[PDB]
Every structure is written in structure tokens, then in C-alpha cells.
């Protein structure tokens, strides 16, 4: 029911970034304008990477709202018999589809449908102004996407491989076996999965043919020589036929490279210009290598005023865990807020030494990594995070360096909570939570990005056995023996740790955060001495255990599957801290003030150091050893053992999950501004923090070619329609 709809009173916050924009110089403004346009263009491909009906739903919504804005459409909808709550439910649904670039939650991977009868919405759409202006197109879109817009058939409710889930990273007939075979083939060919999808068809016999389609402007036709053009052929792999193609989301990426070229003229230094040239190469040919070189040049660009990144970056929504969803952000540095994080970087190399693993399992040389607090102007794609550690190319992360980023105006939008909505806490805890959540989050995000993802040495072996470490002298602390497991050529973290890689790495980074947060030097880096560092520590740990309880919302018990990486990680940390016993953390079911099942989380401040730190140290050592050896077997054992959701006493997590759902709060949607070019200058357009405001932000988002983007998405959808 309410699990698969967005509530009509869902929170909507407006991204606050007038001041960061007003800081920018004219050239910086035009640079950010063209980068934002490129990012917005590329984010449309997320619709294709989400569900088969998502591009149609986007086209239909954007056409509807081009013809009539929310207020114009309200009059029609109410004249056609809808109620104000039903029209509001439609507005909320459209705003969700816009904010996620799809009809599935980017945070939860669950479908959501309009919360009103389908026949009434049909009455609205077919009688609309866009219907009277384009009967064929609107009626075709409706007949194509309507019942899929509403259907909650159990196989449609969650993203996933196989038949019990939905994914467009693969064709409908693909299973985890097909993804595993595809990943082995890609590893054998040194072709990254990031910008690729996998389609499986059959001949008359029934023999599966595999297509690995690359995302590129150019198709399968003679173009200027690349490392990509040689790879466009058929292969045989373990008896299966594979076909490497390209040309995926081609006109979308065409628009993207147009805007990237235009931004290249207003680049500040040669680092930005060369990174943009390499991004154009990556998006036009299909080369993950070109994107790697661009990312190298990007890491070299230190402390720019307009920070940005774009491409098929994160692999959270690939049900297998290696393919990347498109994203792209433009942001302005916030030097005042970046002061504390540059401070954290100042003592970072010496801070790593305190982590619970020997320096043979740590990166060889500490590279001074850029860490800035950013104010977002654009974050296209399915979701806006709080912070990033990028690039995700671990080779680059170990040789050239990496960038850490804390999105300040996103953290600020998320900082606000009310006392009533703070569930599963006793009243004594809620006050400390309210008072310290923000600063504790600065601490936790800094530790998570810089010392979490930024720590760890992966043992890689060459094709001639050239270990990047010392096989003779490096000893495994968990067995006392020498190292026996490692990564090979083409093998990556996602490649070997597939479905659990994201959640596992996130769990490691946030355990690092919880662990190094006791260090008083860290707490004074953020200006919290013993008078208040006490409380910031306790609040960080209480927030962690509460998040571990709340994570039960993102677990499908029928599939025994975790749908969100960070929440699975926090449930793992909660179960770990429950494991040590000694009355540290206690989940106790209660009855709420409203007469419904509630729960309470008790965390003892004293046993955080005496009991919590030993368990976290043990756990961190296990995680890091298994990560550095690439021990998929033992890593899966550990993680999928802690991530196991059971109704075993006393915790009874399966019974708690019903309470967590019954008292869940929907994540707020975030309205983002647009930028316009008045020929000479660049102006910033903000919007109401509402469903209608987000709708308007997407109606004014593509003023030049909106109706063309709708048809591009429709065409790319119809072309692949046979896959689902």
C-alpha cells in the first residue's frame, strides 16, 4: 500500500545556492551554465537505466506540463471530476518521477505509483491541452505506459535481476548467472562495465546470444580510431556468443558532449580543458579509459571555484553491482565550510596510522587529497548525496589520488528534523540528538570520506606476477600466514564483490567513521573539546544504531535481499554492536503513545569505549583484510552473515521491520535551480519548495529542445521494447 506510493504531504526542500552563484565570475558562470546543461541532458539517461516505462512516463509528464503548468492543469483536473487531494497526489507522483529520473525510488529501489484512480487520471490526460494539441502522441504514450504506471504486480515492486525484479541494466530474461558470465567476459576483455548494459536474446534453437552495449554517441560504424573500435566485434566465451556494441543513449550523450564542448571554452585552466576533452572522448567513443584519463586530469585540478564531475559513476542500482548510473554535478567551493575539512586533511596521513590494520595493508604513499565543502547548483540523476569520494577507479585512487566532497547546501537541507518524527528514541536522547546531529554529521562525513573510502590497499598481481606488495614479508593478521588471495588484471572491487560491494565498502567507511570519531584530535579539528565532544561522540553512535534499526524498511524479506547499500551497512553495524552484548545497545519493542507498536533503542554511553571500540576494531580488521585480499568467499561469509535478517530472540528483527515500516517517514524531494543565458549574463532561477515547484523546475529545465528530448527518450524506449 503506502509502501509503494509517495505521501501527499511529502517534504520538499529547495536547494539554497543563490549566494554561491552570486560569488561566481562571468566566465565561471557560463562554465557552470554549460556544465549544468550537460549534466541535465545526461541525467535523462537514468530514465532508460531505471524501468521500461520510465521514459514514456517522463515524456508524457513533461508534455502535459509544457502545455499547462500545475495551476493551469489543476483547473482542468478539477473540472474533470478529480478532487484536490487526487490532483495533489498526481503532482507528488510527477515530482517523484522527476526527482528520481524514474518511477522507482533511487533510495530503496521500490516502485511508486500515482495515489489516485487510473480512470480519473486517464480522464485528465486525454482531455488535457497537450492531448488536444497532439492526440496521436498523448494517446500513444498513455496506452503504452498507463497500466505499467499503476501496476503493483509483485514482480514489478522492486528493482532486480531475474523474474521477481525489474531492471533495464539487463533484459528481462537475465539472471544473476547471466550477469556473472558477463562480468567474467568483461574482466577477460579489460572492458569496464560502468558505461555498459547487457541484453540477451535467443535464436530459433533457443541459444542465448549476448550483447554488451556501450554508452556512446557514435554507433557501430567507422569512426576515428580508438581502443573502442577494435572491441566492436563478436566473441565466444565459455561456449556463449558475446557481441560488444555501442551507441547507447546516443542522442542524449550527443547533447551532453555539445554542452561539454561549449563549457570547454570557459575553462579556467588546462586541467579542466583536458579533463573535458577526455570526457567528450569517453562519451563519444565509449571509452572508460578516456574517462579515466579525464578523471586523472580532474584529480590534478586542485581547489577550483566551480567543481564538477560527470559520467556513469556509481554502481548502486545495477542489481549485479558493476554497471554505473549516469550522474553529473556542478558546485561552487565553500571555503569557510571547507576550512575544517582541509584541517582534517592536514593531519590525515598520521590519522590513518591509528586504523586497526598494519601499514602493509594500507596505501603505499599518502597522497594529499583534495577535500572541499561544496554548494550544489546541479546534481542530475536519481539522487543527491551528502558527500562523495571520487573517482571510483581504484587504480587512480591508489596512484594519482582522489577527491573528497561534502555537499554543504544538501547537508543543510537534510539537517532539519522535528521532535515528533524522531522515532525509536527516548525523550532524553532526542534532545541530545537535536542539539548535536549537525556537527556530529560533519565529523562522520569527514571521517567516512577521507579516512574511510580513502584508506585501504588492494593487493593486485600483474600478468607476470608483479605483486604491488611484498608477498614474502607481508603477513595476514587473521591467519598469521602470508597472503594467498589478491586481485588480478582487469579484476576490480565491484567485479569480485558484485552484489555486496557497495554496501560492504560503505560499511567499512562508516565503521572507520564511528571508530576514529573517539580520537579527540579529530573532535578538536571540528572544534569540539571534551566539554562537548562527549556529546558529539554519543550522538554519532546513537544515530548509527538508530539508522541500523531504521534500515529494516529497505529489506525485502521474501527475496532475502537488501535494497539500499548504506542502510544495509548500518544494520550490519547495529548487529555487530548487538553481538558484543554486555548491555551496550538494546532494541526493545514497546507500544507507542498513539496506541500502535513502537520500539526503543538504548545505547549506554560508558560502554561505547569499553565494549564498542573493541568490537568495531575486530570488525574493521576483518573487513579490511578480506577487502585487500579480495577474499570474496570470506567477505561474503562475514557480511551476509551480519546482514542476515531474522526473527530470532531477543531482537526479533522481522517483527521490528513491521514497526519500522508502520512508522517510516518518506525522504524529502529536493528542488534544484536552473540557469539561463540572457545572451550576455547568466541568471539563476529558483522555485517553490513544493511538488509544483519541482514540476516547474523541470518544465523550465530544457527550454531550447524539450519537445525533442521527449521524442529522443520515446525513441530509445521503443527501440529496446522487446527486451522487457
Amino acid at each position: 500500500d503506502t509502501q509503494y506510493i509517495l505521501p501527499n504531504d511529502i517534504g520538499v526542500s529547495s536547494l539554497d545556492c543563490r549566494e554561491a552563484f552570486r560569488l561566481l565570475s562571468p566566465t565561471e558562470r557560463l562554465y557552470a551554465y554549460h556544465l549544468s546543461r550537460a549534466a541535465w541532458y545526461g541525467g535523462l539517461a537514468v530514465l532508460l537505466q531505471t524501468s521500461p516505462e520510465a521514459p514514456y512516463i517522463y515524456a508524457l509528464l513533461s508534455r502535459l506540463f509544457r502545455a499547462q503548468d500545475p495551476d493551469q492543469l489543476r483547473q482542468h483536473a478539477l473540472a474533470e471530476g478529480l478532487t484536490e487531494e487526487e490532483y495533489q497526489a498526481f503532482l507528488v507522483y510527477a515530482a517523484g518521477v522527476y526527482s528520481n529520473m524514474g518511477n522507482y525510488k533511487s533510495f530503496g529501489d521500490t516502485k511508486f505509483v500515482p495515489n489516485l484512480p487510473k480512470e480519473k487520471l486517464e480522464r485528465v490526460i486525454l482531455g488535457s491541452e497537450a492531448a488536444q494539441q497532439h492526440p496521436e502522441e498523448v494517446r500513444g504514450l498513455w496506452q503504452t505506459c498507463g497500466e505499467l504506471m499503476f501496476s503493483l504486480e509483485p514482480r514489478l515492486r522492486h528493482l532486480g535481476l531475474g523474474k521477481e525484479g525489474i531492471t533495464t541494466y539487463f533484459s528481462g530474461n537475465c539472471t544473476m548467472e547471466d550477469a556473472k558470465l558477463a562480468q567474467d567476459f568483461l574482466d577477460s576483455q579489460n572492458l569496464s562495465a560502468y558505461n555498459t548494459r547487457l541484453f540477451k536474446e535467443v535464436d530459433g534453437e533457443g541459444k542465448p546470444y549476448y550483447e554488451v552495449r556501450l554508452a556512446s554517441v557514435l554507433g557501430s560504424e567507422p569512426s576515428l580510431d580508438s581502443e573502442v573500435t577494435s572491441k566492436l566485434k563478436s566473441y565466444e566465451f565459455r561456449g556463449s556468443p558475446f557481441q560488444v556494441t555501442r551507441g547507447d543513449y546516443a542522442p542524449i550523450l550527443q547533447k551532453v558532449v555539445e554542452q561539454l564542448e561549449k563549457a570547454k571554452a570557459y575553462a579556467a585552466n588546462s586541467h579542466q580543458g583536458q579533463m573535458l576533452a577526455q570526457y567528450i572522448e569517453s562519451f563519444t567513443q565509449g571509452s572508460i579509459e578516456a574517462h579515466k584519463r579525464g578523471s586523472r586530469f580532474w584529480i590534478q585540478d586542485k581547489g577550483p571555484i566551480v567543481e564538477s564531475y560527470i559520467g556513469f559513476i556509481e554502481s548502486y542500482r545495477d542489481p549485479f553491482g558493476s554497471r554505473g548510473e549516469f550522474e553529473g554535478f556542478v558546485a561552487v567551493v565553500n571555503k569557510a565550510m571547507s576550512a575544517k575539512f582541509e584541517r582534517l586533511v592536514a593531519s590525515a596521513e598520521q590519522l590513518l596510522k591509528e586504523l586497526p590494520w598494519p601499514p602493509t595493508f594500507e596505501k603505499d604513499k599518502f597522497l594529499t587529497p583534495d577535500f572541499t565543502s561544496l554548494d550544489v547548483l546541479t546534481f542530475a540523476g536519481s539522487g543527491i548525496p551528502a558527500g562523495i569520494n571520487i573517482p571510483n577507479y581504484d587504480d587512480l585512487r591508489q596512484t594519482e589520488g582522489f577527491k573528497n566532497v561534502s555537499l554543504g547546501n544538501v547537508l543543510a537541507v537534510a539537517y532539519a528534523t522535528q521532535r515528533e518524527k524522531l522515532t525509536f528514541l527516548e525523550e532524553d536522547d532526542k534532545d541530545l540528538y537535536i542539539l548535536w546531529k549537525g556537527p556530529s554529521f560533519d565529523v562522520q562525513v569527514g571521517l567516512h570520506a577521507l579516512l574511510g573510502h580513502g584508506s585501504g590497499k588492494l593487493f593486485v598481481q600483474d600478468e607476470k606476477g608483479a605483486f604491488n606488495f611484498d608477498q614474502e614479508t607481508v603477513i595476514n593478521p587473521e591467519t598469521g600466514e602470508q597472503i594467498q588471495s589478491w586481485y588480478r588484471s582487469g579484476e576490480t572491487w565491484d567485479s569480485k564483490f558484485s552484489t555486496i560491494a557497495s554496501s560492504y565498502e560503505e560499511c567499512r567507511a562508516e565503521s572507520v567513521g564511528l571508530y576514529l570519531c573517539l580520537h579527540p584530535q579529530v573532535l578538536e579539528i571540528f572544534g569540539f573539546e571534551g566539554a562537548d565532544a562527549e556529546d558529539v561522540i554519543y550522538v554519532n553512535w546513537l544515530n548509527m544504531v538508530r539508522a541500523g534499526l531504521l534500515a529494516l524498511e529497505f529489506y525485502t524479506p521474501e527475496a532475502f535481499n537488501w535494497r539500499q547499500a548504506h542502510m544495509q551497512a548500518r544494520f550490519v553495524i547495529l548487529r555487530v554492536l548487538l553481538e558484543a552484548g554486555e548491555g551496550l545497545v538494546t532494541i526493545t519493542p514497546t507500544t507507542g503513545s498513539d496506541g500502535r507498536p513502537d520500539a526503543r533503542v538504548r545505547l549506554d554511553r560508558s560502554k561505547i569505549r569499553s565494549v564498542g571500540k573493541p568490537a568495531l576494531e575486530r570488525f574493521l580488521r576483518r573487513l579490511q583484510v578480506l577487502k585487500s585480499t579480495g577474499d570474496v568467499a570470506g567477505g561474503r561469509a562475514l557480511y551476509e552473515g551480519y546482514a542476515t535478517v531474522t526473527d530470532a530472540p531477543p531482537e526479533c528483527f522481522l517483527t521490528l521491520r513491521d514497526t519500522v515500516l508502520l512508522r517510516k517517514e518518506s525522504r524529502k524531494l529536493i528542488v534544484q535551480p536552473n540557469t539561463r543565458l540572457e545572451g550576455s549574463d547568466v541568471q539563476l532561477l529558483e522555485y517553490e519548495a513544493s511538488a509544483a515547484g519541482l514540476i516547474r523546475s523541470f518544465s523550465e529545465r530544457f527550454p531550447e529542445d524539450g519537445p525533442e528530448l521527449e521524442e529522443i527518450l520515446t525513441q530509445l524506449a521503443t527501440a529496446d521494447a522487446r527486451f522487457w
Binding site: 533510495f107 559513476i313 556509481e314 548502486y316 539522487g383 548525496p385 551528502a386 562523495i388 569520494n389 571520487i390 571510483n392 544538501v410 547537508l411 537534510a414 573510502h453 557497495s502 565498502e505 560503505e506 567507511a509 548504506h566 525522504r667
Partner: peptide, 4 residues
């Protein structure tokens, strides 16, 4: 890698 990278919520609220």
C-alpha cells in the same frame, strides 16, 4: 562512492 557516497546519503541523508
Amino acid at each position: 562512492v557516497x546519503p541523508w
